[PDB]
């Protein structure tokens, strides 16, 4: 059970912290092609990706 429970948060909801923390600290690459995404005012293509 410690190989389920003291086997730690895997239960891996720190990947959600990677999803918001990497939705903010990695928004400088996906939005770097997509700053204007659904238009062309700041002239960028609507592409960011769903990976992770």
């Amino acid at each position: 059970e410690i190989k389920s429970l003291e086997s730690s948060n895997h239960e891996f909801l720190l990947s959600a912290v990677t999803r918001m923390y990497t939705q903010i600290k990695q928004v400088w690459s996906d939005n770097v092609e997509e700053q204007v995404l659904h238009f062309e005012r700041i002239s960028n293509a609507t592409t960011n990706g769903e990976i992770l």
């Binding site: 903010i24 600290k25 990695q26 928004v27 400088w28 690459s29 770097v32």
Partner: protein, 77 residues
């Protein structure tokens, strides 16, 4: 350094650019920042800057043009 993670002449390059450039947390726009500033404005900044520095350092552009040294006194001095 790539093979490491696969003054030593000059350790400041990989050292400062490593511990500087790896300690960015949202680096991917900032790479484009240093690129798009530094290309034009740095290249013309240096290539302007040195010729300025001589251009008032000990100028005297006297030997103003050629001092008419004909013609084909082509960088004679």
């Amino acid at each position: 350094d790539q093979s490491l993670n696969k003054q030593e002449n000059e350790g400041f390059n990989r050292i400062g650019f490593l511990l500087k450039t790896i300690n960015n947390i949202n680096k991917l726009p900032v790479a484009f920042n240093i690129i798009t500033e530094r290309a034009k404005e740095e290249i013309h900044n240096i290539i302007v800057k040195s010729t300025e520095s001589i251009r008032s350092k000990h100028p005297s552009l006297l030997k103003m043009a050629t001092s008419l040294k004909n013609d084909n006194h082509f960088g004679l001095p």
